[PDB]
Amino acid sequence: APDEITTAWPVNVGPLNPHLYTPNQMFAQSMVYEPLVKYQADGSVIPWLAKSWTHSEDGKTWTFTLRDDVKFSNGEPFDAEAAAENFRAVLDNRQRHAWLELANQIVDVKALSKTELQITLKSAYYPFLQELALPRPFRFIAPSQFKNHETMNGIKAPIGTGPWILQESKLNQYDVFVRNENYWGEKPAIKKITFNVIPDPTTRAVAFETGDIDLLYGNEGLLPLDTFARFSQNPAYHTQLSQPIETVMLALNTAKAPTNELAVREALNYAVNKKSLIDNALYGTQQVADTLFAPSVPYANLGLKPSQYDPQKAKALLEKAGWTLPAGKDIREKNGQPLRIELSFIGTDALSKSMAEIIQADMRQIGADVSLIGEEESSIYARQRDGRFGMIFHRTWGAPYDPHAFLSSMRVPSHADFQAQQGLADKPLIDKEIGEVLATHDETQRQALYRDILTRLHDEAVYLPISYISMMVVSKPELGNIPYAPIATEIPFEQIKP
Ligand SMILES: O=C(O)CN(CCN(CC(=O)O)Cc1cccc(O)c1O)Cc1ccccc1O
């Protein structure tokens, strides 16, 4: 049918518990569940399930006036009691939301009436509203669908207030969504969306070619980039490539030899020809990055100095630090130790592998021996949490997480960023400033704090920025132009209009 589309995803959508993480897929959570306030491209929020709000002070106390016409898809009312119950369900699982600072900040949530919801905070936390706009955890399921008055141990039916309803879900096969005919807002033009489960990139491309699917929408791993370029020239298809949404980079372990040495980290930051990496591995479809956050990111236009590809300077830095070439060898040594660094990545990911081979080659030219460790997903995530790496592939989180939520999470010990930064003498100071910047109201101090944090991270060469990557689209021409959502992980199916 013509108001029915078929697309694909590498895995199923999950149970669609609005308050939990893996294996729930964010974009699908955002299809079913809705926030109090909705994020926009300009960086503000607009009213959503909450039609208005006031704050005290000195903002520790916020009072939201909720809409009074909203129903969950099962007929039950959305009201302040329903909302307060959801905040309780999430904060009963507080430990698991450590990465998100609002979760440590909420002191209390209570329904003052049916339409009045009061939320009090530990301090005047500036990104309050943006964090409420996230896909998860602060979105609302029907409280009748809690299991014994909680969500952290599972839910019953995934009943949201959103424009889409999960119809059917078959493990390792497909997920089917259907339009909410009783939605409080704008009715979407599409009536039915089918997600076929296709874990392999080339298989996804083939499925589009044979006509089995109408739409692919994702990041740089969506399909092979050479196939994408070919598709963009094929008059029978439609393709798109957005403006960059986030950064892809290596994180270097400042706590582990030999990346513990500033001079070594600086040298590595001159070793990679990033344009060539991009033209070679990413088929020219992405942009070079010479900084943890692109100059376009809020608070991140700082005139930071790039380290341009310069093997001559890389070698000089290494020689000066005492990493010199022994007789007939190509690998530097210092104290008898070789300049050896492990680069760990997901071994099944062909793009990572490609990029890692290029990185390994470039670094060999300046006399560093990069050893490639490709392992399964769990092993890699286990490495990121324990600091068991020399270098790893990492990325930022895009809007609305960048830069505040990304820096926030640098303070959490079981994250890759904390671990990479562990060896820095000024790490306690940086973590303290991250805490300050999030609670500050003085705009000039806020800017000064971001500058100091990002500058120290740049100068200490914690990262090796690689590119700023884009969203991509392949579609049947009949679907028309495919819009992008403000939040990088969401897919605006509601806005597709054949
Ligand atoms: O990704 C992390 O470091 C931790 N996550 C917190 C930060 N997440 C936002 C989010 O997940 O809501 C940032 C995030 C941002 C964009 C895309 C993502 O896939 C993504 O995860 C939570 C998490 C826990 C357990 C398994 C997977 C997870 O993502």
Ligand SMILES: [Fe+3]
């Ligand atoms: Fe996450």
